[PDB]
Amino acid sequence: GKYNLILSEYLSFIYNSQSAVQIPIYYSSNSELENRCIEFHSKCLENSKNGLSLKKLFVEYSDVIENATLLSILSYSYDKYNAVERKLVKYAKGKPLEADLTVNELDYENNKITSELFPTAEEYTDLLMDPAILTSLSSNLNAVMFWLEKHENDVAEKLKIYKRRLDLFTIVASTVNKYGVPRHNAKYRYEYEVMKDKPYYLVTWANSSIEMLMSVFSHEDYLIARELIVLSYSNRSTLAKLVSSPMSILVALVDINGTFITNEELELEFSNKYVRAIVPDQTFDELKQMLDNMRKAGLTDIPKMIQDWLVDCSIEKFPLMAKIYSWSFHVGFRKQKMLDAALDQLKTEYTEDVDDEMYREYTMLIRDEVVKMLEEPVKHDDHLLQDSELAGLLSMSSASNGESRQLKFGRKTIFSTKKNMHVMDDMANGRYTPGIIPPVNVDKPIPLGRRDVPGRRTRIIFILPYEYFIAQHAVVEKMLIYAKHTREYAEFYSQSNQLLSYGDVTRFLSNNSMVLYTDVSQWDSSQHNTQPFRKGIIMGLDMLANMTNDARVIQTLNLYKQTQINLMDSYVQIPDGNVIKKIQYGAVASGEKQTKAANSIANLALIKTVLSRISNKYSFATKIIRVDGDDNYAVLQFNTEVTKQMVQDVSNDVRETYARMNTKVKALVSTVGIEIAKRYIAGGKIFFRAGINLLNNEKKGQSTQWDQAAVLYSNYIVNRLRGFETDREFILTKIMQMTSVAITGSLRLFPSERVLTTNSTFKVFDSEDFIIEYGTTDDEVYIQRAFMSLSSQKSGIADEIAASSTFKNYVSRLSEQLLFSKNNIVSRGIALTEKAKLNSYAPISLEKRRAQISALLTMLQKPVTFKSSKITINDILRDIKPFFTVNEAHLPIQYQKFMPTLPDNVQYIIQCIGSRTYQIEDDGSKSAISRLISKYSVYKPSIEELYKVISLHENEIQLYLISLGIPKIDADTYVGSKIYSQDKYRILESYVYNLLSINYGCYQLFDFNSPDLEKLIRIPFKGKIPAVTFILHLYAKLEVINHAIKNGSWISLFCNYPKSEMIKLWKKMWNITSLRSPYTNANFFQ
């Protein structure tokens, strides 16, 4: 209830003019008071439209100002161009910055003037420094200046922060004011005509530096930020890679005193085990060389901070390092050229000096692993393999973005990347031919996409036709299903919605064991992902072909085989300016349904093969192996205690044993710690990487101005929990400026806290971080009922595409390829279902969401709507609340810290109740209705749709499920069986969980199965209305948790809920009209 004041102050500061007037608009759920709000509105519009003073009416309608609820504030201020500079001149009295062209290796990667690299605009491209975000540099500068101005009179520790950040913004703005501000167009791009006479890499550097200096709360933060901002102005290729590299060695220096374990995918069972740190000497020499490079780059304070820690090597001073490890990834992306980014991968050293004893075993192990995956379904003749064509054709929506191709749906032209749409086009024109897999050769090389991530190399992405997906789909789904229960596939061991994300190293760490962990992300152009890898799979397919008797299955397997034949020789379109290069690359990368699990297989075979060579010199028992994409780790135990010399010799043997297969590696062996892309451990304590740029993005998405603010808030919350903390008021300023909308040149609207923080398709953030807010009031209920009426909108593009002839042909072909003779009873159902997977195409979503925002805006302008009784969540909570009673409690501390970097209140909760131990289905995947969909398809259907579908009669359930690819007999059996009644409750569980972010954010980290939380939640049991007692216990838990988060202290509860209200609510249960935005979720693991 504080945000709107900051909004008002932002408006007053940014505009400042006599002509700048400020126009609130209010609402109340009570008619008479609402008409007085309407009156105030009216009179304000008039007064605005007559240059009359507004300050007089504000007393007359005092009641509305005190008790009614605000919506938004309008603003009439003219163009008044270039006022940002006219304000900014004062904060730029420092010295500007000079580039240094002889730092980056390349020529165009220096921060020199555009004209020195692109004299003509016809060869200009802003894509090497495009922020790719619908928010301006000017927005950032205005926000910083507003923060600095309002915090210009404080006298505390805050002032010690303020002087520091003021100096940082001085350093930045001197450099900016030296030349000027680039001006955004309507699309938030930056054209040639502003950058023609200015440095090319000023924008990303500026934004990244603003984000960093806005995340300063301490002295070391100031040192680090000043030491990166001033060097990131020139160095743009060897900086985040530099400071983020030693961490991998540092984790091998922290003694464990106390540990965490994993059992099943979120279980913990702590251990007081102590483990020393047997680090060799030569890795210190390596580390010393790395610090010499660090100092050689122009870094002074942060080596000293890295140097004074080694005197003790303690874990209490260690979070600084972790903090440092996150300060490296908030400098921006290294958006270099497609060519030079491919050549990070396309350097090959293929040699007729590798072993042959190794590759044959490698090939065989891949073959054997494949056979273990596929023995059962290939043999028992599963339906999903026979009809693999139809399976992939349904599951196209869960695929990659194919190359743009010109379509026509009746009377339009489309350049879609979605392969389902490609299929729709090719069926009509006789071009659909899935059995004949295209070659990939000189006559038709392959396109590319670029998988980027800062501080590392650029990975490549295949962008293929739609036959490759269809071939790989069914076989890869059975392989993944097999890997759900296999432990060693770290990407895929789960229980249908989880990953082993807290690792499985710490079981067998001891004084006798060691662990070798290894980054394997560069192993795409390598000689072990070419020929042997493919041929092992070919061999497995031969065996599997002899392991079935049906012909459809053998054909499907032969098509998958033929796909691997074509992938063994594969060329690659790569432009460079005007001319086009094509390079032989017959190997593996991402952009495929198969790449992930198959790379995991190949790394597993590789490490199993290598690890049987250390056996020539050591006796050990392989206890555990894990492989997940861009990393892999294996633990191993000895007959004795570990020494430095065994570590050194093992490392040399591992390095040379990879060299025997012609494979480069920075081999890393340790005893207590690991480092990988997504996480790392020191001293039996899990830390995480907070490297998600907020004000700069990887590539250019498709979301609106609105939703990118929500994405940024989720990333903000995440990074805060990780450790990287930014000052929240700046973020709120960005959110309001990104939700601000221009109705004319001078009219602009700004919504309020009570529109943006309400559970709908328009939620963006919360008034108090780590806490969703609900509505006990009339007013939040009122607007939630209003916004649900408006969330449902239309897309004319989708309506006209579904009315053409080709779509109709596609629906007909789906039917007669699946079932026939109900052409007007189910086929229409299948069209309505195909509509559910046209929405992946982005412009449809933009049409629909822009329509939602405009419909929202035409009642943000004018007064409010009653919305006609449509029941939602706050209606229920309104009725649950008046039979509560709170009382002060006092819980003790009995749970262990294992995420130090958290804010102290969340940690206090974790340090008093447990951390989560299960993961209950956000999708309802284990639900008996969903185990059909995961059997005949991959398709999601959103929990809104399922929660709705179950509310209907037993007739249209059959239509809706058969329309999702499922056959008719099992649907009829499901309805006759009466299993939906055994699944109303699970679906509603998942629904309510999706509505309230229970599996999305901070609430993913908390134990609701605790005995300590439960004894506070004293709601007696009634029985035979399970939903009510369920929601009551859940909501009471949420009350206690929100009180804990927002105030630190604890409370109890009690609800002697009357049976009358139990029954009144039981009927309100399965008629809920509520919804939560996809863009608002904050997955802690990305």
């Binding site: 000189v442 005007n578 001319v579 086009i580 290069k581 094509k582 390079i583 032989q584």
Partner: peptide, 7 residues
């Protein structure tokens, strides 16, 4: 259209 060839 334009093409340049490597192996």
């Amino acid at each position: 259209v334009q093409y340049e060839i490597l192996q």
